[PDB]
């Protein structure tokens, strides 16, 4: 399993042609399973879930996303709300793959994509695995922005290896995760022209009159599906209170909180998350 | 596996001879495992686990305890604080069958032993699986009593059919676990003068001077262990704002929390309560 | 003041004739304050708030209003969602008494209509007062009914004096304000077969499409206006945890706790209330 | 009233002489009242408490104390922990001044030490006002650092001016409090090598034996007054979660928040603060 093998690319109508890049694997699975991202600048697919879909890949189909603005997908000017946007893309390529009602892993903004879609496109979803998820948190404690925020903001201001090398250290309980390798690579993704424009257009889409699709604690309630929520307890973009109005009005929720563990769960705590995805969704 | 097959016993020493009913199972398995069960009226080891010790077995060497006041264990009239006096009966068990470092699984009156233990004894516990426990526990919103303490209180006032039955009905989610059988079944061993001397003998020991080893609240930042809370969205004995301060100040905790679930989690959710203990004590 | 010299009747429109029945006091004062009471059997304006009427009147303008269902209002056999119902009738007070724009006191369900006055009337509601409130409130860790909400339905399914005064207990910290005087007042009031057919449309109601006008607290960030919020500690009606959503998302929001409080705040902690209102509506 | 007209100073003995600067005003009145100022670099009872001495002489005898390390109090290169020293420092002065059972208001770290004061001295310490107290609080959502204690942590490796504006900036909700001459005067004060002796000494107090003395949160449940905590909602140093333990577990407890409020409750919400530590204090 590698990047290149993987790789597939689909054209999709959001408001005029979209390029979508995703990656495949486990084709001969029964179950068909799709990852959605992270948000943070340089972030990408392959990179998000290195620790997992090799694993997951064993028991499901698994289709993993670069979100528009993300990766090899395109990367527009101007969007609307995003986690619409990003679910108008991903309900196109359901249509297309042929997929019917199909689970989704989502961390972050990938989580909150997953979510809006769930809402949006209620017969196209199954069981939900969201990963300190943005959208369907609410922080009822922590003032917003929070820190992990305000180093996402300081970068789009200001893109510098420094400022992103800080960015990154507050998405980790164990700082070490964050090599000089990681973020050479992430800087040279997250400086081309290309992806700074993707980080703009996402600044004024908070700006929207479409603000309150962002707002899907408020919608939450009407899932029907068991959701398993996910949290670092040292998450310090989306801080555990987050997870509560979610746990308390989506009927078929879990949750599963890891001490020392920031706001990468999947990669912090690869095995345990690993294992409680395969569990949750069947063990395929 | 059978109740009779399995029951051992022994005689400690707290403050005078104790006589210790408990089981033994997966004797050949390499790693010893402590259950400890909850405390409500005709409660005792077998019952409390009866859908979770043969599956346990098959990885570890089980020892379910009957704690004192409870099962076939003595019943004295006096005591100390609960969780204290619980822990010296097996302190002294440890010693008798040769201990060193244990892991403790303990539900509702057993969390709060199993933790009294681990702080009293630091040498003598591994890790911890506490579901839905007293003492380590501390309702922030939750006004004391709980509408589930109430229905304990008012069945020992008024030890009748109706009181426990009603007693029963708010430790789950779905009350059709409380079957006819279970109500008569508990109130047989509930209602006994041996069982309901040892139902005032822990009133009593409310008012005691060494309160304070109750509040374990105060006390479990000192565990070095890893420990996994689980919980019952749904649990109206020991709510879920109940976990908060255990879960922040316990260096290596995780917390999971099952909806539609309430007090009697290893019950309730009784699959995915033993492969959560499977998985967190090794896997064996 | 007395019940006699305060009361006054209005007819307004809600799908017809509705006559609305309130006290008025400190006619010759500037400001206009209008209370909205609980929701509780047997509740009216009078009884609610028979402490903090005489104190207001000092420095405003005071309408204490029935809400249709309660007092001497009309109580009909059907109704909608009762919130939006109740504003509208206070909507019609509004424009018969002349009234501009008007701070608003509602605690528990008068406060729901209070806020649900404030989202449907944005231009006619200046600040609020909300104790215990129903509707914007959720309940984030404690499960749902609340011990408050049950014993509130099983008075409605069996209306007899040893339920209510069960309800009654568990609406105050302090037990002994529930006098065999105030169950059987309460108990003639609620017992009366227009209350019955009331309790019979509350029911209803619930049943109906518009019951998401009842979960106020996905709207809330809307108000522009400060907001009080008051709760008692000990709340097993509507408890602490849910203040939390209120507190965070309204703007201006403020919110004071009283120790040794339940869910009756203008009563237990009658002066400590009447001066933070006073205080917080100008000092008149 | 001046900074001078104010002044005084008193020597008392903890572990040899001390001495104490303090400001004094409304000597003619009947009711004695401490203050007790935030821990932040360069900060003191004068510039802390300007809003309020003057009010607050107004109704009550005041007493602003300069807590050792911090304004013109004794600055030593070495002490223990801070709170329990700064008390012993109270005591005395209390002894000298020849005070009785004296209501205390402290925000932050003085905070703090009026907490830890009114543990170690019970009959003399009366009512409390504690404004985003240190120790008392415990953050059960946040990850610690929090932000605020970051930025202070950074200043005290690289006392910079760009440093001490990062911090001060986040001490506030209106960040247009921060203005330049604010900057330049803490950073005055904050960079004389006395005031760098005093930061040495409170950094070493923490790897002090006696640490435990710090976590307050753990024995306020044995205060017998009444105590009023308040918080701003944005509070990004001792931020609003905790606040719970203490709401919960101190008997007589009262809890105020304030929307649009940081850490400095007393210089943003100035006049809300007073009228509500007057009316608490009994109106003198
Ligand atoms: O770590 S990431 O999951 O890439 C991430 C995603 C979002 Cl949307 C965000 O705001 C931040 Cl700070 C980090
Ligand atoms: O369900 S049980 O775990 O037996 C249980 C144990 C205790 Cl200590 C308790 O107070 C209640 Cl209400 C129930
Ligand atoms: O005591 S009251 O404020 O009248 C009250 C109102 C409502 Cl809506 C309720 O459900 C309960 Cl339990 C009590
Ligand atoms: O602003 S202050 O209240 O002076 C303040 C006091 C302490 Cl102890 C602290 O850690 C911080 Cl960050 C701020």
């Excluded at 499901?60 to 946007?85: C, I, M, T």
């Excluded at 943005?134 to 510098?160: C, H, M, Q």
């Excluded at 081309?192 to 980080?199: D, G, I, K, Q």
Aim: proline fraction near 5%; charged fraction near 20%.
């Amino acid at each position: 399993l590698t990047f290149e093998s993987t790789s597939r690319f689909a054209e999709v109508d959001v408001d005029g042609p979209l390029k979508l890049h995703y990656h495949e694997a486990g084709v001969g699975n029964d179950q068909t399973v799709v990852l959605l991202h992270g948000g943070g600048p340089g972030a990408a697919s392959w990179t998000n879930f290195s620790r997992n879909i090799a694993v997951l890949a064993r028991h499901f189909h698994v289709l993993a996303v670069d979100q528009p603005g993300y990766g090899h997908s395109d990367k527009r000017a101007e969007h609307g709300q995003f986690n619409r946007y990003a679910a108008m893309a991903l309900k196109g390529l359901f249509d297309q793959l042929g997929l019917g009602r199909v689970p989704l892993v989502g961390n972050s903004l990938g989580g909150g994509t997953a979510v809006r879609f769930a809402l949006d496109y209620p017969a196209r979803a199954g069981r939900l695995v969201l990963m300190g998820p943005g959208g369907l948190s609410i922080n009822l404690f922590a003032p917003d922005p929070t820190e992990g925020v305000k180093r996402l903001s300081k970068f789009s201001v200001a893109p510098t290896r420094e400022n992103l090398e800080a960015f990154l250290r507050v998405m980790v309980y164990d700082k070490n995760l964050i090599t000089p390798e990681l973020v050479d690579q992430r800087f040279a993704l997250a400086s081309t022209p290309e992806s700074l424009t993707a980080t703009r257009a996402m600044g004024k889409s908070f700006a929207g009159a479409d603000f309150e699709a962002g707002m899907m604690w408020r919608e939450v309630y009407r899932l029907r599906q068991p959701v398993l929520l996910i949290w670092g307890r040292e998450d310090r973009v989306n801080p555990l209170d987050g997870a509560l109005v979610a746990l308390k009005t989506i009927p078929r929720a879990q949750l599963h909180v890891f001490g020392q563990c920031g706001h990468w769960v999947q990669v912090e705590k690869f095995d345990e998350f690993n294992k409680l995805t395969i569990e949750f969704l069947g063990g395929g």
